[PDB]
Amino acid sequence: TYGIRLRVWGDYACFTRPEMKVERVSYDVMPPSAARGILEAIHWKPAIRWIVDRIHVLRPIVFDNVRRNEVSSKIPKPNPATAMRDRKPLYFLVDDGSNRQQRAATLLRNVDYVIEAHFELTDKAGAEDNAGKHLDIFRRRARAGQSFQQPCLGCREFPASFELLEGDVPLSCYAGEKRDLGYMLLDIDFERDMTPLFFKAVMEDGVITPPSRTSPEVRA
RNA sequence: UGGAUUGAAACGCCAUGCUCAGGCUGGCGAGUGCGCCACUCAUCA
Numbered sequence: 001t002y003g004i005r006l007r008v009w010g011d012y013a014c015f016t017r018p019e020m021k022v023e024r025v026s027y028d029v030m031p032p033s034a035a036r037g038i039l040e041a042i043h044w045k046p047a048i049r050w051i052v053d054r055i056h057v058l059r060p061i062v063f064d065n066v067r068r069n070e071v072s073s074k075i076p077k078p079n080p081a082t083a084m085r086d087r088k089p090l091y092f093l094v095d096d097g098s099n100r101q102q103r104a105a106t107l108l109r110n111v112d113y114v115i116e117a118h119f120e121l122t123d124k125a126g127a128e129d130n131a132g133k134h135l136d137i138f139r140r141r142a143r144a145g146q147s148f149q150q151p152c153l154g155c156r157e158f159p160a161s162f163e164l165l166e167g168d169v170p171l172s173c174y175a176g177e178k179r180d181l182g183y184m185l186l187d188i189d190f191e192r193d194m195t196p197l198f199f200k201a202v203m204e205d206g207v208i209t210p211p212s213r214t215s216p217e218v219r220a
Numbered sequence: 221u222g223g224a225u226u227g228a229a230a231c232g233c234c235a236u237g238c239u240c241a242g243g244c245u246g247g248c249g250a251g252u253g254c255g256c257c258a259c260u261c262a263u264c265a
Contacts, residue, residue, distance in 0.1 A: 015224080015225090016225055016226090021225060024225095030224095031224090033223090033226090034224045034225095037226075038224065040222085040223080040224080041224075043221095044221060044222085045221065046221070067231090068229070068230090068231090069229075069231055069232080070228090070229040071228065071229040072229090092228095094229070094230080095231095100230090100231085100232095101229080102231080103229085148221070151224085152224070153224090154226085155224090155227090156226090156227080185225075188223075188226090190222080193223095195225080
């Protein structure tokens with residue numbers, strides 16, 4: 001493999017924090033998990049996986065508030081019930097009761113990122129050269145505007161415009177370390193389905209994330 | 221074609237600026253003042 005740097009940008013974005021999920025407050029930047037999820041919406045096969053090495057932030061960080069009427073708890077049943085016939089009308093109250101939540105998103109604006117990513121090979125590989133074929137298929141798809149689904153920027157309410165960046169990583173807005181980003185999520189683990197969080201090295205120009213598949217945490 | 225702390229997620233239903241009220245009651249544009257004085261349609265077949 002050689003790595004590939006994709007450019008992804010949009011008007012809105014919401015990479016929700018883990019704490020502030022009900023009244024969403026996004027991270028300042030795209031996290032590695034969201035980035036890999038963007039990638040797997042352009043090309044992905046169960047033979048490969050995506051790892052992220054860097055994420056370049058090319059624009060100011062600017063927040064915005066948008067409240068939406070949203071379904072609340074789909075509350076567990078207090079009394080079991082069954083439909084009168086097989087295929088007939090059944091519903092969900094989205095306007096009466098406490099089934100209207102009005103969640104307030106503190107989502108980003110006018111975001112622009114460049115993701116560096118690579119190709120490991122897992123079980124169900126089939127061969128040891130899958131990296132080349134799949135990397136080149138993804139490159140073709142990025143160039144031709146093709147995709148399995150329109151990538152989002154967090155939620156599907158915000159679609160991501162994506163191009164294949166083959167030139168130099170363009171001028172960013174951050175040339176000296178005036179931002180530290182705190183302590184972010186690395187990538188939701190699925191071997192144990194837990195939350196490994198990584199940030200122990202500052203963000204200088206491009207967030208330098210460790211591979212989620214080798215060092216799950218500084219604890220280990 | 222697993223998996224973007226994701227995927228599902230109206231701020232939505234309704235509401236008179238109404239009822240009525242003189243811009244009225246009266247007040248000279250008036251009192252005076254030369255258009256005046258003076259000038260050949262002439263001289264000739």
